[PDB]
């Protein structure tokens, strides 16, 4: 049978909506009309049984108990949609030039300290993850430094997990978390630990969506960042460690091939505090776009821990 | 606004979320999960959702989980009818449509009520604001004989609106306002019990939330649910509401239905049936079972439900 639509369906909707009701949130009520339609049609057309609705309405309580709606947004790729439609905006305006943005992910935590120039970011011992000085300049599309830029960034430790949300116990606040103001010539630097890839939570709802489609929920080793500076959009972007095998095989999505910097052996690291002398560089310089008219049309506004 | 979801890129990101060309695996629920994102990537394109729009929408999927309501707002937006709809429309093409009109059943089953031949006693918690109610009726197939042995279970709430095993305000005695007969030889069973009180949604909850952003109330009329089953027929599921209830037709989960709006009798004598009042009231819901075609129930419902011990 066929039903979505008779009439006694689409009254259902307009009600359930109250696209009739007196004034109120009307695009609300306008996109909940919209994505109860697609339901319903759905459920119609692929006869999409009681039991299977029953067992995908218990999917979102787990998803939510588990606090995962947005690694599972990250997972089934909303995430990167979302910086397709953003990146098309920015073609269709005729603008190039900018590092690529990439996803946030639902890890960031404000709050984090600001220094000046150089942040040493490694609070907690990590004797598996070895020393890496992150460093680069921050321009404008005019090719021109800008001085007392903030560049955040935030990343895993040897485990694949972040401070705050570390399962297997806290971490010292802001590990692996920094913020600098670059320097009068657009340069920052972090000095930190080489991170590991992350993985879902396995008992978590995004996993368990995963495996049942038959996918892993890996990522390759990464660096998230997030830059802005006086007359400059905010960017949101990350790198990925050179190599990594998982690189091309994102299970958010999220790898783009201007963002996989060289990574340089180097030497003499004590003298810059690092644990060894020998340590890992990576100089990942970042481009910003200018604002319009003086507005940024493209900052993101989410829920985000805080310390 | 841009319209990128005819492109490449995005579906191929749509198939390759949903692993379309991954191994074999469970296909049924690649082609569901594709359907579902591919729609919500076209809606997200044609309305123009923006992020912030997205995020607060994913901010809310982790609220509504965090209540354990997801199961609420599927009754609270249509969805649970709809399923009763489809359900209904499968009957109607089947010839399986002359049994008594089904409904949803809501949320709150528990399993594990004890059961009783013929008549039970379901109150078990005292309640001053709720007066003395019998509800009673005769279980027959369509073919009009009664079924002996059939077993319905009714679930109700008490005169704050509130269930046992979903009391926020205080753990009621298991199983209250719960319970199950076996009918008699006849076909007879009855409840004695209290008369039950709509009720809204936990009003911090995601579903209130949502309903307050529709400008929408989150209210039922007051009612009693059913499941009735036995042997060589479909189980259904029903409800009757209590005639008279100002909710009665807008009642925020749209279970409503006319032939399930039984009259309210006035009795006296309620002392010598153990009811803690001379007036009571008595309410006749009679069952139409319809006996399972093919030898299968193609319309019975596996869910999550509580369960508890008495
Ligand atoms: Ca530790
Ligand atoms: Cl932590
Ligand atoms: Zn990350
Ligand atoms: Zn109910």
Redesign the interface.
Known sequence: ?K?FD?K??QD??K????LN??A??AR?????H???S?????????D?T??????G??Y???????????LL?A????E???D???D??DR?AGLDGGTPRTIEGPLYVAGAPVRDGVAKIDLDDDADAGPLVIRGTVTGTDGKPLAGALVECWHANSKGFYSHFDPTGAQTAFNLRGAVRTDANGKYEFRTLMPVGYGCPPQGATQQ?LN????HGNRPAHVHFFVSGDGHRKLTTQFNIEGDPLIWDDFA?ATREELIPHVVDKTGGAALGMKSDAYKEIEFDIVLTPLLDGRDNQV????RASA
Do not use: C, S
């Open positions: 049978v039903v008779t006694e369906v259902l909707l009600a359930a909506a109250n009701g007196d109120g949130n609300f009520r306008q996109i909940v919209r994505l109860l697609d339901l319903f049609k759905a459920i119609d057309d692929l999409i009681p039991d299977e609705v029953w067992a309405v218990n979102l309580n787990k998803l939510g108990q588990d606090g995962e709606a947005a947004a997972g089934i790729g909303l990167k949609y979302l397709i439609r953003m098309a905006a269709a969506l049942g489609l038959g996918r999505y993101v506004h989410r829920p």
